[model samples]
Structures are given as C-alpha cells and as structure tokens.
Target: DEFPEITEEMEKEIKNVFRNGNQDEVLSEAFRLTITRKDIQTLNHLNWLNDEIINFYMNMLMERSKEKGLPSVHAFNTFFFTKLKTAGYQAVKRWTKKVDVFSVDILLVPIHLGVHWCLAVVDFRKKNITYYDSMGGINNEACRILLQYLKQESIDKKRKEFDTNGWQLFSKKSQEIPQQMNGSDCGMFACKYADCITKDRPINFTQQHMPYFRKRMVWEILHRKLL
Candidate 1:
C-alpha cells in the first residue's frame, strides 16, 4: 500500500450505516480515522482521492445505465428538470434524482460518499445534458462527489486539450448570459426557468428591471463566441 503509514493499526472501526460495505463506508471510515488521528494533511489528500473514485464510479454507472437501457436519460433529466421547473430550481436540486446512478449535477460515485461541490456555472452547464446543482451548499456529500468527478476528469492528459479548451470557452460564455440579464443577480438563470403556475409566461425578467429587457437565447447560445 502506498500509504503504508496508514496500516491496519490505523484503520478505524467501521459502522454499517447503510450495510452496503461500499465506497461511502470506505470514505467515511477514512475520514473518521484521519480526523480522530488529527492527520489533517493526509485527511485532505485522502478526501480528494475519495472524491475522484466516487466520480469515476458514477460516470461508469451512468454509461452502463445508458448501455443497458434500464431507465432513460430523458426520463432521468425530465424528472430532475421538471422538479426545478415546477417548484423553483433550488428545492429540487439534489443527488436524489437517480438513486442508483450518480447525479450528474452532484457527481456522487458508487451511490454514496460525496467529495466535491464548489463548481462555477460554466463548468456546471458544459455537460452533455444541461443541468444545474441546487443542493450544493447544504449537501457536502454531493459536493465532494462532484469534486471527485472533476479532478479525475481533469487528470487525463490526452483529454486535457479538449477538456481545458472546451471548459474555458464554455465558461466564458456562461459568464455572458448573466451580464445581459435584468439585474445581474446570480439568480438570473434560475429565474429563466419556467414558472409552473403560469405555463404561458415564463419568468418575467423585464418586470424586475428594464421592462423591455430582451435577449434571445441565440445571444446566449453564441455568448462566449461573440466575446
């Protein structure tokens, strides 16, 4: 073991919280041991590793789910997005959308154990399917899981060119959409989501400010490009 220092003696006793013996258990035990021993440095490093592994698992599981055609991505996406549409995005933003697969929004791997969450809007929207993370602040597990996904995705050297360039460009565009909004509050995007009660009228951005406020989605579509 590379971390021979953390040998069997340092192993923390396990708790069968969910009785899964899964990555969550591994991460929880590792976290507890590191915290109890005051291994601050090692704990931080292990925490990162824990996130990477979880992201890997979730990505693999989603790929598998797609391959098997068990449930559908459309079904999955709609369930999550519809919840955002009806009750406001924040209430439904969480890892609960797909219990088995990792929430692409949250990035949990192997079902549990979140590792990362602090991501900007551009990075969040660049996925194959468009989604947003809502439970980010309160949900540490989801946040950590997302962090793990991002770190692993960032490490591939060959994919580096595409990932970096694409993310940077996408991130640039992600910024533009808000700058053109009514008030420039971070909540601008969330307000763009359709109001369930008033199906005909989506959120009225102009009413808040610039009553004539108007920028076609095409503008945002070409957002970063025009820069």
Candidate 2:
C-alpha cells in the first residue's frame, strides 16, 4: 500500500521552515488558525507534536469533512478536553454556539493527557463513543465523561436528554487496533487514527508508516489539504 510520495522540494521547504532563527515566523493560515515555524517545528524528526499542529490538522479535517457529500465532522480544539475535564460543561458549552454537535456525523475530541496525546470519537452513525490511545490503554473514563457531556449538551441545547440507548463505548485495545512502537509517535498516531476515521477508511496503517506520515503531514499542512 503506497501513500502519497514526499518530494525533495517539499522536504526542502519543510526544512527551511524549521531552520534556526525562524521559529516565530508564520507559515500558513486558514480559518484564523496560524501555523508558526515553532508550531511546524514539532513535526521535525522525533520532535513530539504540539497543540497547534494537532488542532490545525483537526481543523483541516473538519473543513474538508463535507467534501464529496460524505458524512460531516465537527472537531474540537486541543484544549477542549482539559476544559471539559476540569471546568465542567459550562466551560466548553459555548464551543458549539452556532453549530449543533448532533448535526455532525462524527465528533473528534483530541485528548492531551499529561503530555501524551490521544483521541476520542463520538460517532452518531454507529451510536458509539470510542477512545483511541496509541500506547494501548483503556480510557472509558474519557468516553463516559463525553457521554455525560452529551447528556448535558442535549439538555442545554435541545431541552431534552441525549438518548443513551444502544450506544456502545470503549477504549479500543492494542489487540483491537494498531499499536505504537515509539513514544514520540503517539501524537502522529492519534492524528492518523482520526484521519482514517474521517474518510471512512480502515486503520490498516502501522508504526512503519509514521516516518512517511510525518513528512506527508508537512505537505498537507502547507497546502491545507490531505493527500
């Protein structure tokens, strides 16, 4: 299975952007989201990812979620989880002020757990909330927390309770999904999991694909499009 090739010119551009003395320079902007050299630098070899990279990528996913008439997606920013976990529903209650969460088919939640990145999903189509951690740990607490939020969200926004009937939830295990081979790649894995799920594609990709993915991410970010 071949992914889009990363050309020499693309690599050179990425290198130039990450070069010294350019850390604060802004490289691209979309939907008011800016990517600084310091932000893109996180994608450099073995440099663990940061919030800007994840949130920007997630934003791109949502922006394109309606392409080709596919099921739409609504992705929360990197800070949504921590706020929801620490501040209660009212804290992040306005994030969807104009848009209804229930209108989207998939809700992508980025989980920044103590510097380790993970992802969770609320799939309206399948009626399930699943957490995906590259290191292979159960995160039912996060799933449950999101379910509780959904209950409150329905009440606050729709004046009714969110139906809990027949909804399955779980943190997919290593045996159930691909596992990470290195610590630094967890951020990449978390994003890739969402990438595949966004397109309704299978999670057949493995650790060996990360190096290429990291490079590809640079191109994708630069163009504000997925390859």
Candidate 3:
C-alpha cells in the first residue's frame, strides 16, 4: 500500500528480454500482449493502479460530461493537485487555456497521495467542493482548499471575488457515496464516483462493484469511451 514493487516474474522477464538481444521487439510485443488482456491497463490486479490509468479514466469522465450534457466539466490530470500544492495558482494557470473553468458546472480533481488515490469534486452549480476518499478518510480541508482555488481562479479570470453566497466546502463522509473496503480499490471507487456524478447519476455503487468497474474501466480506456 505504500510503494510499488517489481515482482520476481517481472524482474526475471526484464533480464531475459534484455539479454536476448531483441529487447525492443520483445518490449513492443509485451505491450501488445498486456493491452489485449482483460485486466490490462486497469486496476484488475492486487496492486495499485499507475497514474496513467487514473488520468485516462478522468479524461473519459470529462468527455462523457460533454455527451451527457450534464455540465461543462473539466477533469484535471492526476498530477494537477500535486502541482497546485507545490507551485501554487499562478503556476497552473496555463492548464485551463482552452476552457474557462469558472464557467464549468463541475471540476474533477483526482488526488494522489503516495500510493493512495481519492477525488475532490467542485460543483459550481451547487457551490460546493466535496472530497471523496473511498478508504473512509475524510479530507474536509481539501474541499476548502479547492474552494479557495476557485476563488483565486475567479479573480484571475474574472477580476472579481468569487461569490460564496451559499457555497459549501466539505467532505463526502456524511453523504451517501460508497466506500472501499480494501486498500487498493480506492482508485476504482474514485473513478466510479466521477463516472456516476458526471452522468447526473447518484453514487449508487459500492465496494462490491469495484471488481466489475475494474473490468469495465479496461474496456472504457481501450475504446476511448465510457459505457
């Protein structure tokens, strides 16, 4: 849960492939084989998913937002929250060159803390930023931080203080969102949370749905579409 480890089989295969003199060909073939597997490119294993899977899934959520006509949604990449923390608002301003985030109905920020994953959703319509951690770890501070970000973003884009007439900054602990029972499934839960909310659907699924969602995400990522 704390770190990624190369397995014995993976180490052996790496050494063998490198020693066999056709390393490039072997690596290419391995990539092809991996992608064709049912669990490939997803959190279908016991380990935590890499950021690529999460980022791709987040982008899918953004695209689905357009199709569902739910709202103008902007899902930031996995590293965004970290960059926001490290470099501050001015540093990440260029990220929204194409879309004015203040006008968007929802903004999805995928939070990556070491080996764990969570989600923070900014609902401009509801005027609330909700933090969702499937491990039952509540981060009300994250919600407030994002709310502050929205304020700064508003001033930067609109040159005015963002109205907080009835804005709420809170975590989803008191809400009806699903929680993951195991450690490794947090990413899956986060993605599912984004998926349902993007479709204007309730957070209906639970930990029991993680396995199915994992498989579902594989196809979704492969086809560049969500079902």
Please provide TM-scores, in order, for all candidate models, with all chains considered together: 0.20, 0.95, 0.79
lDDT by residue for model 2 (122-195), tens: 99999999999988988889999999999999988899998999999988876867989889899999999999
- Write the residue-wise lDDT of candidate 3 on 141-200 in tens digits: 777777778788888867889888899887777346777788889888888888878777
How high is the CA lDDT of each candidate model? 0.26, 0.89, 0.71
Candidate 1: global Cα-lDDT?
0.26
Top of the candidates by TM-score: 2
User: What is candidate 1's lDDT per residue for 1-227, written digit by digit as tens?
Assistant: 11113223222221112123333223222211211212111122112223332222223323433433233221122223224324543453353333422232222112211322222221234342122222223333333333433443343322432233333211112322223222222222332321110122223333243211112211211121110
Model 1 TM-score relative to the real fold: 0.20
Please say which candidate is ahead in TM-score: 2 or 3: 2
Candidate 2 vs candidate 3, lDDT winner: 2
- Which order, best to worst by lDDT? 2, 3, 1
TM-score of 2: 0.95
Q: What local lDDT does model 3 show for residue 121?
A: 88
